[PDB]
């Protein structure tokens, strides 16, 4: 007998105030009972479970299923109730690595740890809560009652406790062998290095020697999978990676469910296939919960889909990470609030690609969106590679400088260089800081009756120019914007505009270049056409000349 | 200190479960070295999967220090930790601190590591050193001693701190010492060279009782509500008078008796913005009477310790930032301005982060608590970058302003 260290038990508790489960066992057929007795008799020999007396008051129902070709019954213990009553754990497997963050390991070995799993003991004080009952034949004897000594499959804590138990066992080995990487996937343990096949095989044997200390045997996985490893939806090749095959289906009838699976594939593919776009295909899902609803594709969604088929026509791949090279991120504007990007170290050899969609909002501009994309990529790059990339941005240095020096919010983007890739991001208008000498002064105002929704908008100027337009189905805020629009339409290339609308000032001072309001868009188009615009604000109803004059014109 | 002070969360509240945000490789490495040493010294221990709690952690560099430093963001835990009256019903925040000529800030958080934390409460201090690219499970620790940045620490340690200082305070009755979190604030009215000596002698007294050698020098002589000032001009354009009337109308929400009738009268008609308008005698008097009103303090402004303090900040350009601290709108308790922020002439976000820290420091000195900030910045930009420039062991609360306030002009 070679002494073997015990695996440290994790203490487990029920949620505060809650007791164990007390679910009734279902009646089973004679055949299922016979099967369960055989299975459990074997499990009991292997130490997994133990018989218990009638004092234990808890119970979880057990079942008997089977596979079609597999000529055996399968035992199933439904721990759904016990899981509801079990404490929360640290679930240390939520996130999976991204392939673009991985580094090349020429040599990779796969070990099966399905048997080490059962070496992880269940906290003795918690075992009572896992009791289950095999109903007896003809229910003429007491049912055979068992409890678990090992982490049950299907119990809430098994994944976190197993993974944490393996990690702690592997730590000294990983620490003292810095030239090897370890990842466990289901009951597969994957051990890679960049050593020669000889030195690599030696590390494996050393790892096996190490794992024997806890009595863990670990042979090689059954039917060693040749490359590429099919892992978490990817294809991991020795020198390249890509997503698994992206195939767009052909259809003349698209339902609300068909469009969701297409966005899913497209999104998944966007991490390597550059230039994927899903706006026009996402717009067809704005608000719906029935999935068979056949929503016709707009000529914009068709064009988008076909643009994706062209990109998806040929397989593309990313490379793995070289820490000795720079990390570079390049962004393009695609339109309609859509942005793409590529992250690479060598030109044309992308580590990964991605996209960024504009946030929902009534107004926005291209510089704010580009800034937001930069922040997303920054955070993604820190996750994957632990560093911020150098950015190549389709915005001139002088444009950025003008933007951040004048914009009312603090803003920042990390080290970046201009890349001349149209369409370039630009500032479409800039308001004056001071009133313009020699430019006509338009005093604008608008008003609307709350009940009738009738209103007026117009202006008076220092040259005696005047206009009032009557409006229907409008609001104070809308007439106030309309008045500014009229002044822009009716003035020359330079114009001073005086408004009393805090609402209108707040919109324009936010420097939108596009709006969900057609009226704001029209105002944007006018500003773009001007040489100089000074927009001044005054308080309403104070007797300010010009403003007082137009106020009475538009208030009935 | 063998005996631990029993600590509980608030009724019907679980421990914190805050996500660890991603960290660069160099910050992870710094944290691994720091925490390994903390673990060898018994200050923290590895924890198992049965602990589901988490508080975020990052790495910084104190003001003028090349050494990496660990900072735990205990904001969630602190609001979930019971309210404390450890020794008394409370320590009255010293109103004399804000009056001293000079005030020095001493980092004494290292003292906390000598007091053990209640064994039952330790699980709530859990934190994770994240891996890169999820390539390994994070390193999971919990505290065994009073952690820096935790609300409970100064309260539990207060009995010991008061005794450490009594001999010093006994001989310097005119020096005001106040503790907020991990910091002592030591103020005096005496010669800056003499004050620095007293501070210096306060430090070596700490060494004998069992530090850090760093300091911070403030001058709360000069913290007030800056007056509202109006232009003094020999010729006024239409635009000038429109700006004046708008500013005066804003001030009339704050000050009673502000009048604009005679100034508005000047703008009778529909005039070019650049036309020069001569002031009448009526308007001159009204302006003069407004100026007089603006010299006095705002009526009925009082601090209420039961309400939050609110701090607003405006970017004024060219490295200048104005700010106001208040509890109710138009009842400013303090206002100020900042220029040429240190080492950030090209970085808006660094400047804003430094303004936030300076304003929080003023708030601690005046009222003994931190304000809730209204920040002129988009959430995603702020949350990506602020930790890169943070140098303080506390962290305030903040919210984001997305609509440009018209009042930025009035504080120009
Ligand atoms: C080691 C490992 C394997 C897998 C596979 C699962 C499946 N199914 C997943 C992860 C996350 C792994 O974990 C890490 N993997 C790497 N790098 C990789 C190593 C593998 N290659 C691909 C490859 C190489 C050689 C052969 S070959 N010719 O030997 O058959 C086949 C495939 C890409 C880089 N780095 C780290 C760092 C910390 S964990 C970890
Ligand atoms: Mg009006």
Curated annotation (Swiss-Prot), chain B:
Changing residue 153 to A: 74% loss of polymerase activity. 56% loss of RNase H activity. Changing residue 181 to I: 54% loss of polymerase activity according to PubMed:9533880; increases polymerase activity according to PubMed:9657675. No loss of RNase H activity. Changing residue 186 to I: 25% increase of DNA-directed DNA polymerase activity. No loss of RNA-directed DNA polymerase activity. Changing residue 182 to E: Strongly decreased RNA-directed and DNA-directed DNA polymerase activities. No effect on RNase H activity. Changing residue 211 to A: No effect on RNA-dependent DNA polymerase activity. Complete loss of RNA 5'-end cleavage. No effect on RNA 3'-end cleavage. Changing residue 250 to T: Complete loss of polymerase activity. 87% loss of RNase H activity. Changing residue 386 to L: No effect on RT p66/p51 heterodimerization. A motif (Tryptophan repeat motif) lies at residues 382-398. Changing residue 150 to A: 73% loss of DNA-directed DNA polymerase activity. 70% loss of RNA-directed DNA polymerase activity. Changing residue 164 to A: 71% loss of DNA-directed DNA polymerase activity. 61% loss of RNA-directed DNA polymerase activity. Changing residue 217 to A: Complete loss of RNA-dependent DNA polymerase activity. Complete loss of RNA 5'-end and 3'-end cleavages. Changing residue 62 to A: Strong decrease in RT binding affinity for all dNTP substrates and in catalytic efficiency. 100-fold decreased sensitivity to ddNTP inhibitors. Changing residue 186 to A: 37% increase of DNA-directed DNA polymerase activity. No loss of RNA-directed DNA polymerase activity. Changing residue 153 to T: Complete loss of polymerase activity. No loss of RNase H activity. This is p51 RT. The gene is gag-pol. The chain holds residues 603 to 1027 of 1447 of the full protein.
